Write a protein that binds this DNA or RNA. Structure first.
Ligand SMILES: Cc1cn([C@H]2C[C@H](O)[C@@H](COP(=O)(O)OP(=O)(O)OP(=O)(O)O)O2)c(=O)[nH]c1=O
Ligand SMILES: [Ca+2]
Ligand SMILES: [Ca+2]
Ligand SMILES: [Ca+2]
Ligand SMILES: [Ca+2]
Ligand SMILES: [Ca+2]
Length: 326
DNA sequence: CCGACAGGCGCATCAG
DNA sequence: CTGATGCGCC
DNA sequence: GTCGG
């Protein structure tokens, strides 16, 4: 809210660049400026003042002056009138339609939800499901429901095997009062970086959640990652709960801390933290943190005993999950 | 002034 | 069929 | 679009 007009404008420009221009680095640079501006605890009074922040440059600062003097941005006002742009942006809101497929559909005359519904034969499976649940998936999930979903998944996981650990991550672990979707990190002692002693580890969890009707559809599913759809049970004479997006990630149990750091996010925080690690001569993924030698070649995995360890290597003070938001 | 911009899973498709 | 590439997603 | 070497 504090600089909400500025950060909205930048986010809309970041969406344009991603969805229409297909310029991912301009997308990320707009999101970086938005983010830095959103954490800045003063009402921004001029572009030159925003320019002082990291990630705000000449061009964003010029935009901020226009937005502050007039309350709008001519560049955006054009984009909002351009039918093609608006159509491509709209279509990418369906889960599974990205910038490329949206452009392709729009060239073929497919411009509306109505158009999508009467051409589902042209959609892959993921897209079919994102169309079927189009409105449900743009709804947020109150924490109260996240808590009941957590209770279902943890209990069903335990029925399959008491040694599974399932932790709910993303915005939920960051303490948010609502979440866009559910993210579940899964470990079992039989799957470590050194061996897989049991097959089907994730499949069995998925099967059990389909059996009790919690999971209702599958978008994609391999050996370590499941992306699908789930729904809380509703009681007599009640409206059904919306269908929700669910992601489950099986991580080797000895790499839990790298895994949970990745899966807690936010996405921007991970980009920032991983970019900072490179500046310090490390690389971080969801499995490990490793030094970067002269070559640019990644060395051997550093011992990691906690989340804070990872922060220590790159000389950052610990941030608790709830301070990793925005 | 200009490389580099986080890192990787699953899926669809293309060349051979 | 394998292996490489890019899309869409987290 | 931005920035540090
Ligand atoms: C989208 C995205 C997510 N992630 C990681 C960090 C996120 O917290 C988690 C992704 O799940 P998301 O559910 O996309 O993110 P979220 O839980 O933070 O936000 P929301 O409340 O809207 O659901 O995975 C990345 O590392 N990079 C990315 O680009
Ligand atoms: Ca700056
Ligand atoms: Ca989409
Ligand atoms: Ca989420
Ligand atoms: Ca998710
Ligand atoms: Ca139903």
């Amino acid at each position: 809210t504090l600089n909400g007009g500025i950060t909205d404008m930048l986010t809309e420009l970041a969406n344009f660049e991603k969805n229409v221009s297909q310029a991912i680095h301009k997308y990320n640079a707009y999101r970086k400026a938005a983010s830095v501006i959103a954490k800045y605890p003063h009402k921004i009074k001029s572009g030159a003042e925003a320019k002082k922040l990291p990630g705000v440059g000449t061009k964003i600062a010029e935009k901020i002056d226009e937005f502050l003097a007039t309350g709008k941005l001519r560049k955006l006002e054009k984009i909002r009138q351009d039918d093609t742009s608006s159509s491509i942006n709209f279509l990418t809101r369906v889960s599974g339609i990205g910038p490329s497929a949206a452009r392709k559909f729009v060239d073929e005359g497919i411009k509306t939800l109505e158009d999508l519904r009467k051409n589902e034969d042209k959609l892959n499976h993921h897209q079919r499901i994102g169309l079927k649940y189009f409105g449900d998936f743009e709804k947020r999930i109150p924490r109260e429901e996240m808590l009941q979903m957590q209770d279902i998944v943890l209990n069903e996981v335990k029925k399959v095997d008491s040694e599974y650990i399932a932790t709910v991550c993303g915005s939920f672990r960051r303490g948010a009062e609502s979440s866009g979707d559910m993210d579940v990190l899964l470990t079992h002692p039989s799957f470590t970086s050194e061996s897989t002693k049991q097959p089907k580890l994730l499949h069995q969890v998925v099967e059990q959640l389909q059996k009790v009707h919690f999971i209702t559809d599958t978008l994609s599913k391999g050996e370590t990652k499941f992306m699908g759809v789930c729904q809380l049970p509703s009681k007599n004479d009640e409206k059904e709960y919306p269908h929700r997006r669910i992601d489950i990630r099986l991580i080797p149990k000895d790499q839990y801390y790298c895994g949970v750091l990745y899966f807690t996010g936010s996405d921007i925080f991970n980009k920032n933290m991983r970019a900072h690690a490179l500046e310090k001569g490390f690389t971080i993924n969801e499995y490990t943190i490793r030094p970067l030698g002269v070559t640019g070649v990644a060395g051997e995995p550093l011992p990691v005993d906690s989340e804070k360890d990872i922060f220590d290597y790159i000389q950052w003070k610990y941030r608790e999950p709830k301070d990793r938001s925005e």
